[PDB]
Design a binder for this molecule. Structure first.
Ligand SMILES: C=C(C)[C@@H]1[C@H]2OC(=O)[C@@H]1[C@]1(O)C[C@H]3O[C@]34C(=O)O[C@H]2[C@]14C
Ligand SMILES: CC(=O)N[C@@H]1[C@@H](O)[C@H](O)[C@@H](CO)O[C@H]1O
Ligand SMILES: *[C@@H]1O[C@H](CO)[C@@H](O)[C@H](O)[C@H]1NC(C)=O
Ligand SMILES: *[C@@H]1O[C@H](CO)[C@@H](O)[C@H](O)[C@H]1NC(C)=O
Ligand SMILES: *[C@@H]1O[C@H](CO)[C@@H](O)[C@H](O)[C@H]1NC(C)=O
Ligand SMILES: *[C@@H]1O[C@H](CO)[C@@H](O)[C@H](O)[C@H]1NC(C)=O
Ligand SMILES: *[C@@H]1O[C@H](CO)[C@@H](O)[C@H](O)[C@H]1NC(C)=O
Ligand SMILES: *[C@@H]1O[C@H](CO)[C@@H](O)[C@H](O)[C@H]1NC(C)=O
Ligand SMILES: *[C@@H]1O[C@H](CO)[C@@H](O)[C@H](O)[C@H]1NC(C)=O
Ligand SMILES: *[C@@H]1O[C@H](CO)[C@@H](O)[C@H](O)[C@H]1NC(C)=O
Ligand SMILES: *[C@@H]1O[C@H](CO)[C@@H](O)[C@H](O)[C@H]1NC(C)=O
Ligand SMILES: CCCCCCCC
Ligand SMILES: CCCCCCCC
Ligand SMILES: CCCCCCCC
Ligand SMILES: CCCCCCCC
Ligand SMILES: CCCCCC
Ligand SMILES: CCCCCC
Ligand SMILES: CCCCCC
Ligand SMILES: CCCCCC
Ligand SMILES: CCCCCC
Ligand SMILES: CCCCCC
Ligand SMILES: CCCCCC
Ligand SMILES: CCCCCC
Ligand SMILES: CCCCCC
Ligand SMILES: CCCCCC
Ligand SMILES: CCCCCC
Ligand SMILES: CCCCCC
Ligand SMILES: CCCCCC
Ligand SMILES: CCCCCC
Ligand SMILES: [Cl-]
Ligand SMILES: [Cl-]
Lengths: 330, 330, 330, 330, 330
């Protein structure tokens, strides 16, 4: 009896709020953006409510599935995703819409959607960071006085596919919560949350960034073991180490997020750069002192202490730095 | 009585202009494009007007929320964003539209939209710049004689979310204004403005750009303290420092905005490059003078002054440059 | 008699399930993304079923072709692609839809669609890896009690275009299968699968990555055949070889997948890098020992063993590593 | 009286052609793509014509504004942009359409559109080039016998926003013209043209490209003043200068247009590269001659002329090249 | 008399096939993608057929042009592009559709469309390659028994714009062909082909890639003319040349197509790399032999043949390689 009723008014229009239950199955997590600070998810969204205007006579007490072109002729709750950037409903080969109605008016409605939603990421410990994210569901036009939104089975209303995986992150700790939201100009609304945690894998970053910089720092210590008389052997080695470290730094910066603070990897890289710089300065000082001594001996007419002490001081300083660093950012 | 009226005509058609009030809540600022000089904002837009054709009997003077499919059967204000590049209305899971009507005909109409709009950025002080942006709302079809547009609550009609954030900028000073606009061929219209100010964070740029250039300039000064007899040691240091500075400049230029004037960072980088070039020329001059002196000695049959004066002159000049630069731009 | 029936209800509504057969012809395989882990396909999809509501009088028992605007007036199966990211129906110059009806109600329905679908990839043997993929077809609203989905001709139902070719992969082993799916809140559904296997071509990687690293290792081995007394000849060669290998590694990393586990190419490149590093350290040790001996003889007042042994030891270790590597990874 | 007419037929159907006037205001120039040779423009397009089927009684002879849903119910001129690649009408918060009708049937119709259209470009003088572009408006379905398209006022029909600007170009000389177009299979049509000129800002390219190459040539000239007995000093400087120039050329080539002819900047860069190459060859010749003479003198048992002549010849040749180059391309 | 007919059936439904002629004017060739293997074209597509149901009384025997909203109420041929990736019809400021009807029922129907279509490119001779491409037009629903598709004027039915051009290719030899296509499940269909040939310009590659590799190979040959006693001159030169060649190869490989076989440019580049490698090995051999002879002289107590032989062998071998290469690949 579609044609006999006005479906621009909710069930119970003018009376108490109508309960609407929600059930979600998560299908996949498609991508994460560190410059845009958002994520994309595909899910099946289910609604439960009753409308006495949709009853029909039957002897079986069983639900029937209808084509889905009928959805545009009846009242349907208006859910939307808060703090989202873009979304759409899949529609091949037809709209991905299910409608099942029982003889007493109970309705099950189901959509397949894709949502891109924002989140606040902290990179102060990158690439050792851990992030938390949430997707928020809320009705748009109806306040809690007209429509009451809740999880259909409480904590049991959220399911996930076994094939959910991201190549760069470990996904854990799915759960659901609720909260009441307030708008100064419209009223009070009930929000539903889907929360989860992401843990990044660190092997790639270690192998591609920490390994080369440490190797170049250790290469800069070769200079201390070379006879100081070979100036065109010790100067080129230091300057080439500086050039290699700078090129590595640029190549790494080509792929990094940009924030108003500095990530742990930046601290590591610039400490290595300063170490190489100080090695070059030390050799310059040694050469100057040797020349001065030669001039004084001419006027009057072995390993230099600085080299033999730096051979111990430099490795100790780097080892201490690494101990503190991997005790803090473990 | 939707079917009993013609809603292609405005309320008060043929008579005085109909007042329309506006109220905006800002949800987020998504991105800033320095190449295209624009920004993307998501907001809630609310309209207020009275229409006697939409009155209905009641007892409680309370507004009732209707489905939202009636927005295409009644008259609605026609507003658009001026100097925008693209925009859309969110439509998952349905159109994000609210409609509330009071018994006497007062209407509340609400939309959720995403808009990309342009702004004129001045990069002459980059990366220390400050920009002023604005978003403009105006009616399209109706001049001020047909439609009167104003802020609903004065300067209290703009609200912002606590989660507004940008990774590169600090946002401040949201406020609203009005101004009359004129088109030669159509008439006079009234604009509404939303203004805000953006200030860039500078630590990332300092560490990634200013620090390595200073370090390379300081490394170019070691040549002054090395014995002038070691030509195959002093020449490679200068040419390698020049090469490293060139690679750093290229890597920096890869990510910068292009303008017909110079930004502060380019001034700093090219002054450093000139310093390294001059150091190479100084060693060339010393070598030539030494050779000439030796030739004179042969035909007749200590530290060269240039080095001992350059060791003082170069750091003093660079410090003077840094003082002037960081007093001008700070 | 389109106007005499209600086509919001399936044929057999209230009774046994309606059998629906499926045929597919694959037209092309468009692209593969190793970052988002998906593939794009264009195919022709065909549906077969009977509907006695679509009969008409005739003497020929021959199919008639109808315009295709009639598709939106009649009941049609609602197939969708499981685990897909986006899809669309081509619509130039009109919708690519065919409708062909026999006098007794047998219906042939055909669409041209493009689908992007996700697939999990294992990159541990990259670039020698073999990948498998599948596309899944299922009904959205009807369970196996309402709709019976099957392959129309069993194994003969899948045809492919002669022109299917990807520049990076060899495509083989197309075949089909079926499985029964379950959703905890809706019911049981029958899934159809299209399976295929990809084999990557390896010539490009052999030319671009393995060759330069081997050449650089053999170039670094030159150091052991140069007289050890030429320190400013032997040190620069090693440090420049390290710089070149780092440049090569960065250039290769620019185009490689990022996973938490190590790929074969990364193992090869970093083993080569360590070989060069060890060569530099060996020369440093030789220089130090020579200087120590000279000082000892002065206090008391030919080829060094290490170089002679390294000329044999280094190539043998590299050849053994290569044999192991190419036995493990084929 | 919309419902009493058939609006598939133009006014005057079967008789003389209906005149249509056009007036345009340009709002912005959004972007320019040198790779694809196109530009993006946003404009307001206005149409003027008379249709007596749209008359109505009135007492004040004043134009009235209608909702804009009526455009789809009445006849409208069908203008399109020739040689465009894509376009759209802005539709937030509704279609940006104005419709004003006078009591005697005169109609004003106004659209806000964004068009991307091609502009052919000659890069032979890049980056000192000047380009011209045009946007073309034409009727699709009606020939000059059915529709007469003209500029509503003349040269005064084009207005531009005060804020139109580009980050790379100076915009000048907006004006209009008309021409008659012919299609072999359909007929003759009127075209309207909007013409403008773009001139590039040179400074950025000068500083980023010409300055480094000149500095590197002047650095390669340093070799001529170094004592010819310092072979391990003179060879590295030349080879490192060549490497630096190659790196600069690659970094610049990352950003340049690709055409079948040669741009000016390529001429400058490759001439500089040839100069550095020649400097290296001259040093090689000097060393060979010195060794030959030394061997002859030993068997029998000052500055070399080539160096003293190169010190004069190289700067003079480069200065002559610059004097010619900056005169040809002005 | 639109409402008096059922236009869901083709003209002649139940009888012989209806002839449809096709006429095409090509407006532009917009882009070519070598990574995707496709191209984009904009064209005007014209159809001719007769329909007695569209006859109307008249006195002038002339064509009448209709609005184009009638296309959704009458029967229209269903052409589509085979092996296409995406396409659309331009719709600014309205649908770019023309419809003309003669009194006897003959119809001219015209569309302006943009199509992306695939092409199998062969890059063996890149960048000296020549490619052929085609665009295919076919009906979707009607077999050759129901609809006869043919060129309206034979080979004179294809016209091309005078402004068609591509920056990287020369376009030649537009012509048309036809063929009969078979589908195993549906039937036989007529296809129309639009052919063209593309020739790549090679000046860009000759300047950017071949020239510097030849220059670096010739720079490697300088070492043979340098006194062999200057080891720290001849070793650094070779290693720096190797580094420069590797950087050049990386920079050019950054942008080139990837295939399972080797392109001509990679053959040239890697042969050059091998030449530089062999020069380094030759100098190492010379140094070792000289040291061995000096040791023999010590135990007993001119230019080396290898260098003077290589001064002839290396240039001649490179010349032979170039003569063969430029004779095979033209
Ligand atoms: C630019 C580079 C690679 C380095 C720089 O210093 C080095 O040690 C490298 C070397 O290749 C070897 C040595 O000849 C060099 C020189 O004097 O400066 C340069 C030369 C060319
Ligand atoms: C949920 C529901 O409606 N259940 C009904 C039940 O009340 C009734 O007794 C039965 C009769 O067979 O049919 C079913
Ligand atoms: C869901 O989990 C939360 C975790 O804190 C818990 O507080 C809540 O009681 C749980 N609800 C159900 C229904 O299990
Ligand atoms: C509310 O009702 C009172 C009467 O009780 C009336 O005076 C007042 O105008 C009403 N307000 C509105 C906004 O309709
Ligand atoms: C709103 O407040 C701002 C605060 O700076 C003020 O400048 C402006 O004049 C105020 N406008 C009105 C209408 O009160
Ligand atoms: C086709 O016609 C034959 C008679 O020649 C008849 O026996 C058969 O049932 C018909 N088939 C269909 C599908 O109508
Ligand atoms: C049917 O074909 C598929 C193709 O992959 C094959 O796997 C399967 O074994 C075949 N089954 C039979 C019964 O032939
Ligand atoms: C213009 O308007 C005046 C009234 O101001 C009216 O008298 C006159 O007839 C109108 N002219 C036309 C051409 O409509
Ligand atoms: C419009 O003005 C321009 C100004 O340069 C002129 O070139 C052109 O001929 C004028 N056209 C007409 C129609 O007056
Ligand atoms: C040609 O047109 C005239 C009307 O001008 C008409 O009378 C005549 O029948 C037409 N001839 C043909 C062959 O259609
Ligand atoms: C059209 O021209 C092509 C050119 O190759 C030729 O093959 C074909 O036979 C021609 N057809 C006609 C009808 O002239
Ligand atoms: C194989 C990875 C080694 C990483 C070492 C990191 C030392 C800080
Ligand atoms: C044609 C390239 C061959 C590369 C072989 C690499 C062996 C480690
Ligand atoms: C700051 C621009 C310098 C340009 C120098 C050009 C020399 C030919
Ligand atoms: C200006 C183009 C030079 C091309 C040289 C090619 C040498 C093989
Ligand atoms: C800059 C190093 C100088 C050393 C003086 C002892
Ligand atoms: C070498 C540091 C490893 C740290 C692992 C958490
Ligand atoms: C955040 C660092 C600021 C430094 C100002 C001199
Ligand atoms: C404002 C122009 C500055 C140029 C500096 C080289
Ligand atoms: C080219 C500069 C050298 C200076 C010697 C007088
Ligand atoms: C398993 C990690 C190997 C790293 C070799 C450098
Ligand atoms: C790195 C120096 C090696 C010294 C071993 C005796
Ligand atoms: C390679 C240059 C040699 C010069 C002989 C005059
Ligand atoms: C630049 C000074 C040159 C002197 C030549 C004798
Ligand atoms: C240094 C060349 C400047 C040219 C200005 C047009
Ligand atoms: C055509 C490929 C040849 C490869 C030779 C190693
Ligand atoms: C590595 C090549 C050395 C040549 C003398 C055996
Ligand atoms: C002395 C010049 C030899 C040239 C051989 C090609
Ligand atoms: C096709 C021209 C080749 C020129 C090689 C020097
Ligand atoms: Cl580099
Ligand atoms: Cl480099």
């Amino acid at each position: 009896r579609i044609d006999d009723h006005d479906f621009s008014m909710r069930p119970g229009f003018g009376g108490p709020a109508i309960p609407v239950g929600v059930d979600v199955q998560v299908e996949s997590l498609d991508s994460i953006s560190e410059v845009d600070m958002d994520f994309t998810m595909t899910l099946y969204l289910r609604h439960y409510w009753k409308d006495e205007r949709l009853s029909f006579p039957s002897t079986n007490n069983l639900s029937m599935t209808f084509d889905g072109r009928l959805v545009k002729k009846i009242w349907v709750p208006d859910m939307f995703f808060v703090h989202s950037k873009r979304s759409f409903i899949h529609d091949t080969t037809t709209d991905n819409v299910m409608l099942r109605v029982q003889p007493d008016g109970k309705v099950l409605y189901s959509l397949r959607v894709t949502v891109t939603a924002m989140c606040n990421m902290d990179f102060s410990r990158f690439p050792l960071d851990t992030q938390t994210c949430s997707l928020e569901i809320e009705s748009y036009a109806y306040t809690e006085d007209d429509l009451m939104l809740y999880w259909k089975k409480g904590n049991d209303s959220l399911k996930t596919d076994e094939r959910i995986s991201l190549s760069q992150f470990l996904i854990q700790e799915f759960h659901t919560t609720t909260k009441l939201a307030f708008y100064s100009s419209t009223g009070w609304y009930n929000r539903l949350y889907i929360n989860f945690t992401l843990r990044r894998h660190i092997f790639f970053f270690l192998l591609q960034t920490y390994f080369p910089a440490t190797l170049m720092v250790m290469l800069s210590w070769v200079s201390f073991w070379i006879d100081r008389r070979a100036v065109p052997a010790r100067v080129p080695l230091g300057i080439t180490t500086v050039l290699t470290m700078s090129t590595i730094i640029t190549g790494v910066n080509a792929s990094m997020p940009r924030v108003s603070y500095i990530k742990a990897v930046d601290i590591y890289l610039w400490v290595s750069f300063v170490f190489v710089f100080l090695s070059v300065l030390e050799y310059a000082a040694v050469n100057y002192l040797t020349t001065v001594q030669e001039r004084k001996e001419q006027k009057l007419r072995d390993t230099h202490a600085i080299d033999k002490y730096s051979r111990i001081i430099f490795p100790a300083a780097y080892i201490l730095f690494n101990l503190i660093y991997w005790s803090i950012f473990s």
